[PDB]
């Protein structure tokens, strides 16, 4: 019951070429405004709102690390997960400081400036690298989404832009959230940032999945929420 | 014959995603700079050096119009061509001004800037659309790259970044250059902009039946030649 037809089984098409190489903007572009805001909210959550602990699990990390940059300030161990091994390869390749890795330095640096500009990029990248000890398959369709890997129960589950990437129906989303509950201590945080399933459905789904919302903000809209498992 | 593995039968991968949405700073500065240089160059070649006339044919246009922006000020009519029908369809969305089309604004603005702001963006897009009359499939391995479609001989043939997209071997390149000649009036201009061995390109253009007027590094090269 997914609606999205953008996948790693899709062919590269001409519009993909255009977007990679002939897109230009300013800090005032729509697209750049969204990323600005995501980064601001992750900073606010993990640095200003008190979301911290021993262990955080990112569910649907794709090939991306920007979503962990503030998070490595507040968590001793981070675990990154995605269903697709090809995404995992991008992450591993960056985590090992391999030369084929994507260059995040511009985003890293931006995040440093946001945090009470102290730190320079290389130290931030080191800390995130020190923090992640495991890169894993996840399938949230299963009641044990990390499978047979044994993980202590976690203090935070994070997930960014998975609705936007898959467009699942309401029941699929629900089931996914309920299954993530299995990874989390009682009282542990769930942090979600995603695009709009509308506001009332997202809340309903989070409640029914077994979580109490403490913060929910909306800005086609980008939402952000923090909740705790009962 | 060709060494590039990047085609529309490739599958989208995680690096393509990353490059669409997270590519900033130095890697993307370089691209803006490379593109600014091409634009300046086409401005030089078409608006300053008097490469002009009635008919220009762009060979291997891709899904892209940036390479025509200055050309439409010097040519009454432009014909855009590419082997891939998917490219043609992307160009058509933009020419027919459909709202699903790609937004070229900041490239259009940058060219209006290079031309002393005589004109504002929309007027410029209008001049380009009015100038493009036909969108045609082309196959440069054939003696008549345009098939059964007959055009008068052009004043100029333009080709942008095709060596870099396909990585042909030399003879393949030389024979394609010759087959293109068939579209061009005697004495007509060939303008190539591509990735760079300098003499290999030079020898290919000579052998294909052209005289080089100007060659320049901007390794990205630019070259104006004339059909013998």
């Amino acid at each position: 019951g997914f609606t999205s037809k953008d996948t790693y089984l899709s062919h590269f098409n001409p519009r993909d070429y255009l977007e990679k190489y002939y897109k230009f903007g300013s800090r005032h572009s729509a697209e750049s405004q969204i990323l600005k805001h995501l980064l601001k909210n992750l900073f606010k959550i993990f640095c200003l709102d008190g979301v911290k602990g021993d262990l955080l699990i990112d569910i649907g990390s794709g090939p991306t690390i920007y979503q962990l940059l503030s998070a490595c300030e507040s968590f001793k161990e981070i675990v990154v997960t995605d269903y697709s091994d090809q995404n995992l390869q991008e992450l591993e390749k960056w985590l090992k400081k391999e030369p084929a890795a994507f260059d995040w330095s511009p985003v890293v640096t931006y995040v440093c400036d946001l945090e009470g500009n102290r730190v320079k990029g290389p130290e931030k990248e080191e800390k995130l690298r020190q923090a992640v000890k495991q890169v894993l398959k996840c399938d949230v369709t299963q009641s044990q989404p990390l499978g047979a890997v044994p993980l202590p129960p976690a203090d935070c589950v994070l997930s960014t832009l998975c609705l936007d990437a898959a467009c699942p129906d309401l029941p699929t989303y629900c089931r996914a959230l309920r299954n993530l509950g299995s990874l989390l201590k009682p009282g542990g945080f769930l942090v979600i940032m995603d695009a709009l399933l509308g506001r009332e459905a997202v809340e309903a789904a989070v409640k029914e999945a077994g979580y109490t919302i403490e913060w929910f903000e909306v800005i086609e809209g980008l939402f952000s929420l923090v909740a705790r498992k009962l | 014959g060709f060494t590039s593995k990047d085609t529309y039968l490739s599958h989208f991968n995680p690096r393509d995603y990353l490059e669409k949405y997270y590519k900033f700073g130095s890697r993307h500065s370089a691209e803006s700079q490379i593109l600014k240089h091409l634009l300046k160059n086409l401005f030089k070649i078409f608006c300053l050096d008097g490469v002009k006339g009635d008919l220009l044919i762009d060979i291997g246009s891709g899904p892209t119009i940036y390479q025509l922006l200055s050309a439409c000020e010097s040519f009454k009519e432009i014909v855009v061509t590419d082997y891939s029908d998917q490219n043609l369809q992307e160009l058509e969305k933009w020419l027919k001004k459909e709202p699903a089309a790609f937004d070229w604004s900041p490239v259009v603005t940058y060219v209006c800037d290079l031309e002393g702001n005589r004109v504002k963006g929309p007027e410029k897009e209008e001049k380009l659309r009015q100038a493009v009359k036909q969108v045609l499939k082309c196959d440069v391995t054939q003696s008549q790259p345009l098939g059964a479609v007959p055009l008068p001989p052009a004043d100029c043939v333009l080709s942008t970044l095709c060596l870099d997209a396909a990585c042909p071997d030399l003879p393949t390149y030389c024979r394609a250059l010759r087959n293109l000649g068939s579209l061009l009036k005697p004495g007509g201009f060939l303008v190539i902009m591509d990735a760079l061995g300098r003499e290999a390109v030079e020898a290919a253009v000579k052998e294909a039946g052209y005289t080089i007027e100007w060659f320049e590094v901007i390794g990205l090269f630019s070259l104006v030649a004339r059909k013998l």
């Binding site: 953008d6 996948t7 794709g62 269903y83 697709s84 399938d139 949230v140 898959a166 699942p168 | 995603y17």
Partner: peptide, 8 residues
């Protein structure tokens, strides 16, 4: 599969 996330 999706760019990030389920089987696709």
């Amino acid at each position: 599969g999706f760019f990030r996330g389920w089987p696709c």
